[PDB]
Amino acid sequence: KKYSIGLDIGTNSVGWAVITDEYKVPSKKFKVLGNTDRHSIKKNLIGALLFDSGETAEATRLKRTARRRYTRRKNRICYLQEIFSNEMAKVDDSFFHRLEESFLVEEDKKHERHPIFGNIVDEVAYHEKYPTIYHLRKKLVDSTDKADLRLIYLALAHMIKFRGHFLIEGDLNPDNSDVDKLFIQLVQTYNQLFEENPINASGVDAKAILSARLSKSRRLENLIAQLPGEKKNGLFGNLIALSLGLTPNFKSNFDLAEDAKLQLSKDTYDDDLDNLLAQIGDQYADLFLAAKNLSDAILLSDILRVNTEITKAPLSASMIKRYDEHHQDLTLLKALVRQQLPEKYKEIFFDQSKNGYAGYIDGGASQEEFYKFIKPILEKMDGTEELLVKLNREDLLRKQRTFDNGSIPHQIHLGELHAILRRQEDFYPFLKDNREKIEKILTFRIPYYVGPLARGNSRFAWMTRKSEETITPWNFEEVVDKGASAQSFIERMTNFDKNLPNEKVLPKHSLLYEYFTVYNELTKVKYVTEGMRKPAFLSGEQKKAIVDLLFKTNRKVTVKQLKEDYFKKIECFDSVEISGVEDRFNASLGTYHDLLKIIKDKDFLDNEENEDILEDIVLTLTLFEDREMIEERLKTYAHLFDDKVMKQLKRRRYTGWGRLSRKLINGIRDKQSGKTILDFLKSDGFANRNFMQLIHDDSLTFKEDIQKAQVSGQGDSLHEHIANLAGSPAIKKGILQTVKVVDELVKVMGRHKPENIVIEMARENQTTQKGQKNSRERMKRIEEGIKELGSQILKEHPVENTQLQNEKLYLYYLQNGRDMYVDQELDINRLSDYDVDHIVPQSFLKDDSIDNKVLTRSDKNRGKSDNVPSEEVVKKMKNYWRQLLNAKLITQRKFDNLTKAERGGLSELDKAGFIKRQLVETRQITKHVAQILDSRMNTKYDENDKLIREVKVITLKSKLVSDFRKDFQFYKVREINNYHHAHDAYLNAVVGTALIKKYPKLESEFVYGDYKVYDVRKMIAKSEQEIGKATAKYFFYSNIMNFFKTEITLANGEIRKRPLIETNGETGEIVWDKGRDFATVRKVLSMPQVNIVKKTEVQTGGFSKESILPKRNSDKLIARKKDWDPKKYGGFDSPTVAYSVLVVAKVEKGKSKKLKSVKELLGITIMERSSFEKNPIDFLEAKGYKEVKKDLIIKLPKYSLFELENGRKRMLASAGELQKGNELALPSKYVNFLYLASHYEKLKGSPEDNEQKQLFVEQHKHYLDEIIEQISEFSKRVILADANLDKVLSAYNKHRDKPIREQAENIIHLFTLTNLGAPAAFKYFDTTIDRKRYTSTKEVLDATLIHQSITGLYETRIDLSQ
RNA sequence: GGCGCAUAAAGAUGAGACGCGUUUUAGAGCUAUGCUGUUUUGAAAAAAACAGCAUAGCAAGUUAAAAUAAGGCUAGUCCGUUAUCAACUUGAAAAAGUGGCACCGAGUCGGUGCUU
DNA sequence: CTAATCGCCAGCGTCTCATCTTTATGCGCC
DNA sequence: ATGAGACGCTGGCGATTAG
Secondary structure (H helix, E strand, C coil), rough: CCCCEEEEEEEEEEEEEHHHHHHHCCEEEEEEEECCCCCCEEECCCCEEEEECCCHHHHHHHHHHHHHHHHHHHHHHHHHHHCCCHHHHCCCCCCCHHHHHCCCCCCCCCCCCCCCCEECCHEEEEHHHHHHHHHHCCCCCCCCCCCHHHHHHHHHHHHHHCECCCCCCCCCCCCCCHHHHHHHHHHHHHHCCCCCCCCCCCCCCCCCCCCCCCCCCHHHHHHCCCCCCCCCCCCHHHHHHCCCCCCCCCCCCCCCCCCCCCCCCCCCCCHHHHHHHHCCCCCCCCHHHHHHHHHHHCCCCCCCCCCCCCCHHHHHHHHHHHHHHHHHEEEEEEEHHHHHHHCHHHHHHCCCCCHHHHHCCCCCCCCCHHHHHHHHHHHHHCCCCCHHHHHHHCCCCCCCCCCHHHHHHHHHHHHHHHHHHHHCCCCCCCCHHCCCHHHHHCCCCCCCCCCCCCCCCCCCCCCEEEECCCCCCCHHHHEEEHHHHHHHHHCCCCCCCCCCCCCCCECCCCCHHHHHHHHHHHHEEEEECCCCCCCCCCCCCHHHHHHHHHHCCCCCCCHHHHHHHHHHHHHHCCCCCCCCCCCCCCCCHHHHHHHHHHHCCHHHHHCCHHHHHHHHHHHHHHCCCCCHHHHHHHHHCCCCCCCCHHHHHHCCCCCCCCCCCCHHHHEEEEECCCHHHHHHCCCCCCCCCCCCHHHCCCCCCCHHHHCCEEEEEECCCCCCCHHHHCCCCCHHHHHHHHHHHHHHHHCCCCCCCCCCCEEECCCCCCCCHHHHHHHHCCCHHHHHHHHCCCCCCHHHHHCCCCHHHCCCHHHHCCCEEEEECCCCCCCCCCCCCCCECCCCCCCCCCCCCCEEEEEEECCCHHHCCCCCCCCCHHHHHHHHHHHHCCCCCCHHHHHHHHCCCCCCCCCCCCCCCCHHHHHHHHHHHHHHHHHHHHHCCCEEEECCECCCCCCEEEEEHHHHHHHHEEEEECHHHHHCCCCHHHHHHHHHHHHHHHHHHHHHHHHCCEEEECCCHHHHHCCCCCCCCCCCCHHHHHHHHHHHHHHHEEEEEEECCCEEECCCCCEECCCCCCCCCCCCHHHHHHHHHHCCCEEEEECCCCCCCCCEEECCCCCCCCCCCCCCCCCCCCCCCCCCCECCEEEECCCCEEEEECCCCEEEEEEEEEEEHHHHHHHHCCCHHHHHHHHHCEEEEHHHEEECCCCCCEEECCCCCCEEEECCCECCCCCCCHHHHHHHHHHHHHHHHHCCCCCHHHHHHHHHHCCCCCCCHHHHHHHHHHHHHHHHHHHHHHHHHHHHHCCCCCCCCHHHHHHHHHHHCCCCCCCEEECCCEEEEEECCCCCCCCHHHHHEEEEECCCCCCCCCCCCC
């Protein structure tokens, strides 16, 4: 007959269920192919599709930029080698050959094994006089002697292969290179600037307080702490915060009307510096150049070497210093060990797997690991002392190539290169000719807006070519049209108007877009005069009046100002009554004020004729960033402004894009009107219809021309379209999955579309108060918080939200300057020094949000390091947390977690396997699936051009089905089996269809697409009138939900009996039977057969583990390169098997090599796949097979399902491992018992019913042993755990004395032994039960293969017996 | 169910760069002692190493080259790990085609009536 | 000397730049 | 005047052990 389908989707699952007219899952017998006995199997119409999570593209992408980094680096070496090609042949004919063959053994080496010279003695000489490359560096930079050409190549190539970062624009000539000089001159400048209050250092050592190995903010703390009376927020303090690379602000220093922050790290800093300085004047400016070179001298903190005047190669010479101290301290340490602890010398300087100096140098141990290892050994000796000091300062035997070199900019490398060259260009002519070429090799960097330099063979490129030449670091500015390329770079990512398909979108700083939003949001603000009788919308002239009076004067104008600065100045009304916007305006006109502040002429901007010029200018300031490009783009508008004005104009730049086109805003006109949308929003007379009313108006012409959108029925397959969506590819997998599953269901059920399709959405209806509370901007939540608390902490140290965005500071003002653990006063000084601690350890769940974070003096005052703050802290800070709770500062979840300690702390039950990304991903896949099905099912239109809804797509909140499981004793425990998905599907279906049959006048609100207004304001127009829908709507959801209940208890007051049918009189149809339908639910929930299928998918990705393993005597090793023998060079390991192949042939056996017939599973890896799939028989024969049955080759993906005996199923985990393929079908009694007993959801209600469920818990305690029995028969029937089941049973008997609840939680823990899929470890109390893996896939070979559909209804079975 | 705007929490995609790591090779290690081919001296007894290997005591140890998915052809200073995939029948691919209805039951579905 | 257990391991870290979603509430509308 | 909603390594591999 007729039917409906319910779905519950997730990044890992597709829960599907089919209900009928009577809410019962239909049963049907399905045909089975292959060559087995079961020709038919009667199964049910409910199950769940399981599949691996669709992966993001971040990883693949990272690998891609890496590839490009390596190819481009190799080419830089190739340019420099090519420059030396003709001359090196005159010096050494086979130098580059030996360098290119350096990796090879002498056995396979073409020329001499000695890299530089080929002979032995000279190589030894080089390694002697220049122990490192940095000695040669210093020598060639300093000395003006004609050195060897090969060495010049080595220095230059070492500089080039490892250039350094391009983070610092311009160039840094090693200026003072001392904190001292620049700071004295700087203090001099600050004192000369202000005779108002000059502050001196009074001899405080800067070059240790700024060179300290810690936070920039931490360095700043001590620095502002040196001169008392000077705030960290002070002009001096904010400036020294800027020198440390932080993000300061001088808006409170120079009292600017608007916010203005600067930062050295960002590249708009020069334009922002000219901008802000010309804004404050040419007065204060030198302070900032002083800060620039200051930071330049502070950058080489770990690499600062004595004095910069000793040589012209500071970095190289510094490395030499590291080498020297290293040598000395090494000889030192050796002497000391041989003196004091002579027996450990053999372990420290020889054993490589012990983190000794041998593990540090020859082993794989790190500097950090090394320090940890030798520290107690040093301090256990009487000498040392200073070596301990070098260890804490981290400069103990430091090597040369370490991790802190990520700080080295390319400017110093370029300096040593330019120096060697200028000092060596006097001998060789070619490098004197090409010194600028080489400098170009090191300096060249492809701009980000250009991207890959492709010639049309990349889906990632966008660059456009001015020529058609091979782009080199030398012809780059000309061959590449940087202009069109940057333009297309931003244009390839920006959207189009949804309304106007072929049209682009205005920038977010578009004057037309800003006018759009001000007028659209200002077209409904209604006014009621103290004498007025009815609200009346602002008139056409009035809107414009407001705009000109306030919106063009202030950055943003508040409603208090409109009432006080307009109505009293214009209407001169005693009192005002505004009916459209609260507190302040959403829309604003920022671009206009930026402009009026730059060009300083209102008349031009106010002019309408200029809007094309203006819009082109904003578009230009948005598409580009490069000063030259922007400056060139505005040469056409240079006749309208002064040169000084053109500078000010190019300095301002904008980012972002709107949502609508220009043709939509001020372009499309109406036939009867002749005016555009912008005009209508600006004036429509009596009815100031909004944007949405304008679009949806038969009275206007717009709806007619928008219906002309695009064409939905164009060439788009049932796929493609899913893979053509926006966002991450992680979603496309889930969507395709759920739809192909649905299509299979309809293909089964009478080939006609079902009545309804219900899905569950993650969107639930919060209340108004909570929605505004979680969403309060930071100064808001803080200010409301401290005003409620009453502290004058805001009065002692005031900062706006602009400089408040730092984490530990937000926590600091959130907690009112008091530690959440210690009950002490926190300090603004050691801020990054204070620790930010997670409430619930990072071991349980991943949360970086503030609901989980807390600022403390030390994180050890938390109590335990692996749990919610100890009861010692909770029972001493409960008052402060509750008081922090009354200030609306901390959340409910935070107080619950801080108090969860006294509730029982954290059990292993709080597994929390989710990552927020799986949640927004589920939201993405659900929002997408909902509107796809809504259109795949509804195809036809009526006679009045409106779509036919044969099937309705329904959106159910999670809260409804959830509360439905909770208010009818229908609980869910996921870890039991994967049926809870199908249960969610069934419940969503039943609740949905029963719901639309119960109350149809409001059904338009739930279905996707169509809707009736049916305003809920008018629904519960109570005398209280809380408003905001939200609050009204949640109350509406519970209100509609209780009509489904059996007994009605009100939070409003009194009680009410419910009709046992609760059918609707208008329908005249029984909507629900309170006596028999719950029983079909009871059966369904207790139903054994549920079609659970894991998507048999071929593994793809990386070829193998990336870790390069050493030479080894194994066949397990993979050639890293072609000729590179893994037995002599080392190679890869652990290849990932794409898919297993079933083969049958003959192999050799014994010394006589006799051919016996064998069949087995061959492991086909990814790297091998293209080659196997090309010539398969040839590949198998090469593997070592002979006479292979080609038609007896079965392709088996991962998770290939298999069955042997007593319903025992196994899934193909690999070519040599299997997975548990059975689900524990457990009756409802045990499930619900486990729920109530384990305390899964704190089962809040009325204390009475809590004790009743408790009594039921205390009574059916035999359920424990019975459950143990289900698991036992089930483990003995399928799992074959041998020892593990025994360890479990022994463990259950040992803890039979434990409280009931715990036994319930850990019995819950035990299900993982019976869980579907790969076998993983678990615990019962402290007894860790590791996993019993199936290491041989031999039993699969003569079992019964089950090829299954996506819903597992159409099964084809194969008797592996041939 | 849907837009726009403001605030907020969580995510996504693409591009340009650095720094490590790892892997082979180059950085003539030395001395005493055991096994071995011989040569070499010797009347023999007994060693001189020409070298390879095993055992103790010291010496040093920081650097470099090259590789960083195998690779691919379209040969770009490009591309190569995301999405796609049960089985079966046609197809090079794309894609199309392939599985009867009620009832009594419910341990991974069974049984019975109907009908090809 | 097999063959199943046991025990172990997995490329990482940073910076610059640009465009996109997804929910929740608030101010208007289909 | 609400808590759930998102889900959770595991397959290669070498050495240790048991027969």
